[PDB]
From a paper:
Originally discovered in the circulation of pregnant women as a protein secreted by placental trophoblasts, the metalloprotease pregnancy-associated plasma protein A (PAPP-A) is also widely expressed by many other tissues. It cleaves insulin-like growth factor-binding proteins (IGFBPs) to increase the bioavailability of IGFs and plays essential roles in multiple growth-promoting processes. While the vast majority of the circulatory PAPP-A in pregnancy is proteolytically inactive due to covalent inhibition by proform of eosinophil major basic protein (proMBP), the activity of PAPP-A can also be covalently inhibited by another less characterized modulator, stanniocalcin-2 (STC2). Here we present two cryo-EM structures of endogenous purified PAPP-A in complex with either proMBP or STC2. Both modulators form 2:2 heterotetramer with PAPP-A and establish extensive interactions with multiple domains of PAPP-A that are distal to the catalytic cleft.
To assess the molecular mechanism(s) subserving PAPP-A activity and the modulation of proMBP, we purified endogenous PAPP-A·proMBP complex from pregnant human plasma and determined its cryo-EM structure. The presence of full-length proMBP was confirmed by western blotting using a proMBP-specific antibody and non-reduced gels showed a major heterotetrameric form for PAPP-A·proMBP. The cryo-EM analysis generated an initial dimeric 3D map at 3.64 Å resolution, and C2-symmetry expansion was subsequently applied to obtain a final 3.45-Å monomeric half map, which enabled de novo modeling of most of the PAPP-A residues. The dimer cryo-EM map contains two copies of the full-length mature PAPP-A and two copies of proMBP, exhibiting an overall butterfly-shaped structure with a dimension of 230 Å × 110 Å × 90 Å. As shown in our structure, proMBP itself is a monomer. In the PAPP-A·proMBP complex, the binding of proMBP induces a nearly 30° rotation of the βBD towards the PD, generating an interface between the βBD and the C-terminal subdomain of PD. As a result, the relative orientation of the LGD, PD, and SD remains unchanged in the two complexes, forming a rigid core of PAPP-A; but the βBD, CCP, and CTD have drastic translational and rotational differences and thus constitute a movable region. The comparison of the two structures identified a twist motion for PAPP-A conformation similar to a “butterfly wing-flap”. Although the highly intrinsic flexibility at the interface between the two PAPP-A subunits results in a less resolvable density here, we still found that the dimeric interfaces contain not only the previously characterized intermolecular disulfide bond but also a strong hydrophobic pocket between the two βBD. While proMBP formed a 2:2 tetramer with WT PAPP-A (lane 4), it could only partially form a 1:1 dimer with C1130S variant (lane 5).
Residue numbers in the entry:
A (entry chain C): 13 to 1073
B (entry chain D): 1142 to 1362, 1371 to 1390, 1400 to 1536
C (entry chain B): 88 to 222
């Protein structure tokens, strides 16, 4: 078959034999490679080096993986770097995105003597024209060497190499796509210097003496003709947030069938079972109001009530939105204000004196001495012998106290939330909202820590009957309507919806943008909004807004589609009806012949490839019989207390960090278990601090990924992960080497010859700020736990009647071929999922005409809305499988070959308005632009020049926001006040002015202000405004107003409204 | 040096002419006091306004760089015709280099780079200069032809070693590399010290080489004070038989009085001062930051009824502040006398992995700099 | 031995703990010297930080100083392997706002606040730095 080399990081590398003559003028390197997640920083896949002499080194060309930011190692991309012998500098071109750490990538670097180009998956991602002429002279041809998978300085590579290919000519993009489609031998052509199959690795390649030869395995690179992974948008979180998946739910009414959802209301009782937290009257009234609200949206709620008789749990006060660490903090918090709280330990009470005097303790507890500054009467109030614990103890350091958090309540109750929507009750002193509702995409949505926390004081009240509908909408994946205006980081957030769309704001096209308000009407002027002074068609009547409960009475149909789609996606265990999930996307036409057509469809929206069995591991099994599981139990030693062994509830489930290179609370850290008062010990030198992650089902492993989120920026040592030791069930520890990690992409390890079953790993670290987000174990191709499960079946139903034998057969695989088509007839197809005897909802129908074109035909048809048309059905290129072009790609030819146009050298007319990098700032045909000269600023220093505003703007600089310190690289392009920092400007209020003069005094139709920073501090939520005054030749000021600063509006255009009289 | 074409034959107010230069020329499109960048496209269309030309279009020859040593190594360049397009230059190989190749001329080209050299200046390493008390161990290194970048091993005599060598690990062989310029790595088998004589008989000794290896020390006047340094580093025997000139803060306390061979404690009256032995060419305020002077612990009397560490010779200089090893760089302790403040002034050695001077206005590359030679920066 | 009147700066108006007022003194003194000085000239100990708004307002107040550090009330009281921080006035330690690799890099036994960034740094107790007190 087809064979692939596996290079590891230990130093396995090859070199080409001297008989093949290396190219000099033009070349093309084509290689199918499958990288791993953790790489050495300048990793080299293939390089052409010189061993003639160590003078004017790094000449030649090298393709590999390297980070864009060398001082941070954040963004690792494929690069191609060339330096010919006649040149004086080395030019490096990079791809447009971070490399995918587990997928096959067809890298192709070409050079024709004037242009060097890089193609990733057949789409051109970078080009350059700096390097000119041939690479090297024929006189120096003897000492040129071609290293594979390494270099002289052991810049090794971890991954698979399938089809190495070197050409003495620079092929066009069409020949690159042809060699991608046709993976056969190219040795018939005379221009092909070398193409490689790894049947005989000793023929044309010789390994190094120290580094052993890489092992040859079987690859199966071209496994799929349809990419079954659809990414969510930037503001979404799951497959349901995708536009093409939610469009089928919005269009088709067969998806929004009535569904029965089971939910549980939990009331706390004492041991006598006489005192309920919620009375049965308001429980029944809330159930009736809920079934009244959700009857018109085809959602049926089944009420269950569980009585918990615990006398100690009832006496406490359950705090919804408060934190036990905020009680001792002297900042007043509104939510922690109750009798059992102690008014935040007196911190919200003005009778608390600011001094700290520790009074003498004598006798009974005192209400005035129970505050924080009196040190809880010296601990007399928390003593059980003096008085009752449940009404007098306010010290959060004590093991027994008056108040209890709901996250501590759910650990005590340990309610199985996998089958019911658990409703919890807790008291909020601010009372403006309910408790925290867990989103469907959170890791706790099926665990015991997930549910809905409500306030029982307003439960089933005539003025407060709509809060449970709001929290149920939050638990079914609906955001607030004011998310796109009010719940954003700054005015430069990408999710700030200027217009209603499926990808911005609350991910609903029906709901217009709106701020947060308590009114039942349209608000007028508002300072919270950045640029929008007024709003119209505000959804005041929606359940998700901040209006009063009598005002909220309507759901948009898009929110209904989102709720039904999230009930199908993640909430299959709640519904008692075992109807399988539908295929959410229409079947796609892979290819057509003269007498047949081929159809392939996506997996169902549940994401499961096997039947539903409750007491087995059938939900862990993938398309094949592999098993993919996460770390069920975590154990790390407590650093201060010996043999403490604290259990991280984070770093267990699926990875759930938002910013992937930032310190987060959802990750395990070596110094997070300790108290603030104790000194955190450093990790030991020979081993380091370790995390022991245990998996639920021990099996034979083949892959192990670890989501290392945050690493230390100033890290002088080589590898953050010291080692990884797999724990076998036999007791043997199998140790791996120190693994290099990246911030963004997950670390991935391929495990060889691990015959014994592995139940867990131990990750050792010498870094005390390393954060591990999740671990994932992937088993071999045949797993004994997945052999018991039976797979789903698929049935293809056509709108013309099919044959009985063709319609009767249930397909195991997702491929369908029929020969019963007439040449002029039109056929609508769909696929129904059949698990056992029960069938699912129908998929959306694909309409196919046997003569006319379609999506994957290879010819662009503008009648069907196809902006691009390629036969790939692969989302990695510039053209989607839905035949719309991707972001910042342009496709030219009738068989659409696409190139990355946003950072290209040339400037074209269709990207003058969009791009500030390729072209200049866009000036219309009736206007002229003049830039400043000899400008003067308010604050001058030696570090900040102040004269950098003269002339053309810094178009290559990106716009930064939420930035603490502006001292990275922006001082050489733009002016900011050096002498005054943000805290010192906050302490003493000052006004900065920038006075820019112009050589030729003309009229001002508009003023263009180009900014590279919004000015937003990372701790302050306020927006920043700029005021512009035009100055005349008569020295008079004309005001142009206050304008907010957004990175979206990089060249701020301020229109001058001049009165014509 | 251009081709010009006008789409209109008649020249009137409004006509335009497109000029595109030939190969090997760089455009400089300019206006009146307006230096714009060069157009990437070859064709520029010029339109006359009010009977005058709005811009000046010129095409200079493309300036090849003056032929650097990084273009052809070990060569001297003579270019009489210049560095413009079409010019030629000659290169002559060095005296420790051989000129092999058909043509030794470099041509400036259209793209702006000099053409591929057809002659390769080949440098061959000759026989290395000899080293005293060392023997060459490689037989091919005695020849006059050698590869560039290889190592030739020279072994010292027993008792001769590289200075800075440890007592437990005395390494007696080193290697020198043929460098790029035809030279070699310098290495001398010079030992700093055989063994130090005891301080109780210091001052009257006269040696052949001082404290060096195989140095015969005699004291001018049973046995005598004549000893010979052995191969292991030891001697065959040992030597036998009121200070009013004090410093500004020097204090001596004698627990045994002024008897023969008694040891008295030395101290400085200032708390921030340390007592050292300064050399005659080394002053007080100009002590080098790389120098480690010998600190004084005790005064021990000699056989001539004198003091080995004479009190006048003892200088109480400004001692090290106790702020060492606190992840903080200080300008006072940034010297080998105070262990470069415990190595806190270098990024690779400080515990917090970031250099922070204690005053917020100090020279980071100057007085508060990293001067530790063991650090990875040096 | 009480400090001068020109060097003392009064800071008040924090959104959390608006009753407690702080005084920043630019008198460069050590930890023990400034601690006993503001113990004997004022009627309170050094500042004990318990939340973030106090730390942010203190950083805003001391960001204009030419010295890089100011004194707070933290002190390490313990020996062995697991030591404990504590404040000088005996209040509990619940808020920790440290810099990168700060509490596990040894160094001095006292706690200071950096004027650039506001994070806490372990420093030697014999350093002459400005100090913040309260009464």
């Amino acid at each position: 078959p087809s064979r692939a080399l596996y290079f590891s990081g230990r130093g396995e590398q090859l070199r080409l034999r001297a008989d093949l003559e290396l190219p000099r003028d033009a070349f093309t390197l084509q290689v199918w490679l499958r990288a791993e997640g953790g790489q050495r920083s300048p990793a080299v896949i293939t390089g052409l080096y010189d061993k003639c002499s160590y003078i004017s080194r790094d000449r030649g060309w090298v393709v590999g993986i390297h980070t864009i930011s060398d001082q941070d190692n954040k963004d690792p991309r494929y690069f191609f770097s060339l330096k010919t012998d006649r040149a004086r500098q080395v030019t490096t071109i990079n791809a447009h995105r971070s490399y995918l750490p587990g997928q096959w990538v067809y890298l192709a670097a070409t050079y024709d003597g004037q242009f060097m180009k890089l193609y990733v998956n057949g789409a051109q991602v970078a080009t350059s024209g700096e390097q000119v002429g041939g690479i090297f002279s024929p006189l120096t041809q003897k000492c040129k060497v071609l290293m594979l998978g390494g270099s002289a300085l052991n810049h090794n590579y971890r991954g698979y190499i399938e089809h190495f290919s070197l050409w003495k000519v620079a092929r066009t993009q069409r020949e690159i796509l042809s060699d991608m489609e046709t993976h056969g031998a190219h040795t018939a052509l005379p221009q092909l210097l070398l193409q490689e199959n790894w049947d005989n690795v000793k023929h044309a390649w010789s390994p190094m003496k120290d580094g052993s030869s890489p092992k040859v395995e079987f690859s199966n690179a071209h496994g799929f003709l349809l990419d079954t992974s659809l990414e969510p948008p930037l503001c979404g979180q799951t497959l349901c947030d995708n536009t093409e998946v939610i469009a089928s739910y919005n269009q088709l009414s067969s998806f929004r069938q009535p569904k029965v959802v089971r939910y549980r209301v939990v009331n706390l009782y004492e041991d006598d079972h006489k005192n309920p937290t919620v009375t049965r009257e308001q429980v029944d009234f809330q159930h009736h109001q809920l079934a009244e609200a959700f009857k018109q949206y085809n959602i049926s709620w089944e009420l269950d009530v569980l009585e918990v008789s615990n006398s100690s749990l009832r006496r406490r006060l359950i705090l919804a939105n408060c934190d036990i660490s905020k009680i001792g903090d002297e900042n007043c918090d509104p939510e922690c204000n109750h009798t059992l709280t102690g008014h935040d330990g007196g911190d919200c009470r003005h009778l608390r004196h600011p001094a700290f005097v520790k009074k003498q303790h004598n006798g009974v507890c005192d209400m005035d001495c129970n505050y924080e500054r009196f040190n809880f009467d010296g601990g007399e109030c928390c003593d059980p012998e003096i008085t009752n614990v449940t009404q007098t103890c306010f010290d959060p350091d004590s093991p027994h106290r008056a108040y209890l958090d709901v996250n501590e309540l759910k650990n005590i109750l340990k309610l199985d939330g996998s089958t019911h929507l658990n409703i919890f009750f807790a008291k909020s002193s601010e009372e403006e909202l309910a408790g925290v509702a867990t989103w469907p995409w959170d890791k706790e949505a099926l665990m015991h820590l997930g549910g809905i926390v409500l306030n029982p004081s307003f439960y089933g009240m005539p003025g407060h009957t709509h809060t449970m509908i709001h929290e149920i909408g939050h638990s079914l994946g609906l955001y607030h309507v004011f998310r796109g205006i009010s719940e954003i980081q700054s005015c430069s957030d990408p999710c700030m919806e200027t217009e209603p769309s499926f990808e911005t704001g609350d991910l609903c096209n029906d709901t217009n943008p709106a701020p947060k308000h308590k009114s039942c009407g349209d608000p007028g002027p508002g300072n919270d909004t950045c640029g929008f002074h007024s709003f119209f068609n505000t959804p005041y009547n929606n359940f998700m807004s901040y209006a009063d409960d009598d005002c909220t009475d309507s759901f948009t149909p898009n929110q209904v589609a989102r709720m039904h789609c999230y009930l199908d996606l993640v909430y299959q265990g709640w519904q008692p009806s075992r109807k399988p999930a539908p295929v959410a996307l229409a079947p796609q036409v892979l290819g057509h012949t003269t007498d047949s057509v081929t159809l392939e469809w996506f997996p169902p929206i549940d994401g499961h490839f096997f039947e539903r069995e409750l007491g087995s591991a059938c939900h862990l099994c993938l398309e094949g019989r592999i098993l993919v599981q996460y770390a069920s139990n975590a154990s790390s030693p407590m650093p201060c207390s010996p043999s403490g062994h604290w259990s991280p509830r984070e770093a267990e489930g699926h990875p759930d960090v938002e910013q992937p290179c930032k310190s987060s609370v959802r990750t395990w850290s070596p110094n997070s278990a300790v108290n603030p008062h104790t000194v955190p010990p450093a990790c030991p030198e020979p081993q380091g601090c370790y995390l022991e992650l245990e998996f639920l089902y021990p099996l034979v492993p083949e892959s192990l990924t670890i989501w290392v989120t945050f690493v230390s920026t100033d890290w002088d040592s080589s590898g953050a992960v010291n080692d990884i030791k797999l724990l076998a069930v036999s007791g043997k520890n199998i140790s791996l080497g120190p693994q290099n990690v990246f911030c963004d992409v997950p670390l991935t390890i391929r495990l060889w010859d691990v015959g014994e079953e592995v139940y867990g790993i131990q990750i050792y670290t010498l870094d005390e700020h390393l954060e591990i987000d999740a671990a994932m174990l992937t088993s071999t191709a045949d797993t004994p736990l997945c052999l018991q499960c039976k797979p789903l079946k698929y049935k293809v139903v056509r709108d013309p009647p099919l044959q009985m034998d063709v319609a009767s057969i249930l397909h195991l695989n997702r491929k369908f071929v029929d020969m019963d088509l007439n040449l002029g007839s039109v056929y609508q197809y769909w696929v129904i999922t059949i698990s056992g005897t029960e069938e699912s909802e129908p998929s959306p129908a694909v309409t196919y005409i046997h003569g006319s074109g379609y999506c994957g035909d290879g010819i662009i048809q503008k009648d069907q809305g196809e902006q691009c048309d390629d036969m790939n059905k692969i989302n990695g290129d510039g053209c989607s499988l839905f035949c719309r072009q991707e972001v910042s790609f342009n496709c030219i030819d009738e068989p659409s070959r696409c190139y990355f146009h946003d950072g290209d050298g040339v400037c074209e007319e269709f990207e003058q308005k969009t791009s500030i990098k390729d072209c200049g700032v866009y000036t219309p045909q009736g206007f002229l632009d003049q830039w400043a000269s000899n400008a003067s600023v308010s604050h001058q220093d030696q570090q900040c020049p102040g004269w950098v505003i003269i002339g053309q703007p810094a178009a290559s600089q990106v716009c930064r926001t939420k930035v603490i310190d502006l001292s990275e690289g922006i001082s050489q392009h733009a002016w900011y006040p050096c002498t005054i920092s943000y805290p010192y400007s906050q302490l003493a209020q000052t006004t900065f002015w920038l006075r820019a003069y112009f050589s030729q005094p003309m009229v001002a139709a508009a003023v263009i202000v180009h900014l590279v920073t919004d000015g937003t501090y990372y701790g302050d939520q306020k927006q920043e405004t700029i005021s512009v005054q035009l100055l005349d030749t008569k020295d008079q000021s004309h005001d142009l107003g206050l304008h907010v600063l957004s990175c979206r509006n990089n060249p701020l255009i301020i229109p001058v409204v001049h009165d014509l009289s | 040096n251009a081709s010009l074409n006008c789409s209109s034959s008649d020249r009137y107010h409004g006509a335009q002419c497109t000029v595109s230069c030939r190969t090997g020329y760089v455009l400089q499109i300019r206006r009146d006091d307006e230096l714009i960048k060069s157009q990437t496209g070859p064709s520029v269309t010029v339109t006359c306004t009010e009977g005058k030309w709005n811009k000046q279009v010129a095409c200079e020859p493309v300036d090849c760089s003056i032929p650097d040593h990084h273009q052809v190594y070990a060569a001297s360049f003579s270019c009489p015709e210049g560095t413009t397009f079409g010019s030629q230059c000659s290169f002559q190989c060095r005296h420790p280099a051989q000129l092999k190749g058909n043509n030794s001329l470099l041509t400036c080209m259209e793209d702006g780079l000099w053409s591929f050299p057809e002659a390769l200046c080949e440098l061959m390493c000759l026989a290395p200069p000899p080293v005293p008390n060392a023997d060459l161990q490689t037989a091919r290194c005695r020849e006059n032809k050698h590869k560039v970048g290889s190592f030739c091993k020279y072994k010292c005599k027993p008792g001769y070693h590289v200075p800075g060598s440890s007592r437990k690990s005395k390494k007696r062989a080193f290697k020198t590399q043929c460098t790029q310029d035809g030279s070699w790595q310098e290495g001398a088998c010079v030992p700093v010290t055989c063994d130090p004589p005891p301080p109780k008989f210091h001052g009257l000794y006269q040696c052949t080489n001082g404290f060096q290896f195989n140095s015969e020390c005699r004291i001018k006047c049973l046995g005598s004070n004549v000893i010979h340094c052995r191969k292991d580093g030891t001697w065959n025997g040992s030597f036998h038989v009121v200070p009013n000139e004090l410093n500004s803060n020097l204090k001596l306390q004698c627990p045994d009085g002024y008897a023969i061979g008694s040891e008295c404690a030395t101290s400085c009256l200032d708390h921030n001062s340390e007592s050292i032995i300064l050399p005659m060419n080394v002053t007080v305020r100009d002590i080098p930051h790389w120098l480690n002077p010998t600190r004084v612990e005790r005064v021990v009397c000699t056989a001539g009824l004198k003091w080995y560490p004479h009190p006048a010779l003892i200088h109480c200089v400004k001692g090290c502040e106790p702020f060492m090893g606190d992840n903080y760089c200080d300008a006072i302790n940034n010297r080998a006398f105070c262990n470069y403040d415990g190595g806190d002034c270098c990024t690779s050695t400080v515990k917090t992995k970031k250099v922070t001077p204690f005053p917020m206005s100090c020279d980071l590359q100057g007085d508060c700099a990293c001067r530790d030679p063991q650090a990875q920066e040096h | 031995t009480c400090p001068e009147e020109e060097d003392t700066v009064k800071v008040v108006g924090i959104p959390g703990c608006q009753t407690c007022r702080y005084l920043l003194v630019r008198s460069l003194q050590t930890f023990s010297q400034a601690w006993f000085t503001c113990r004997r000239c004022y009627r309170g100990n050094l500042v004990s930080i318990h939340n973030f708004n106090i730390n942010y307002r203190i950083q805003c107040s001391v960001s204009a100083l030419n010295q890089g550090q100011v004194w707070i009330g933290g002190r390490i009281t313990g020996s062995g392997r697991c030591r404990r921080f504590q404040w000088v006035d005996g209040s509990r330690w619940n808020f920790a706002y440290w810099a990168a690799h700060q509490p596990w890099s040894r160094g001095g036994h006292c706690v200071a606040l950096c004027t650039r960034g506001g994070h806490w740094r372990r420093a030697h107790c014999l350093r002459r730095l400005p100090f913040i007190c309260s009464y």
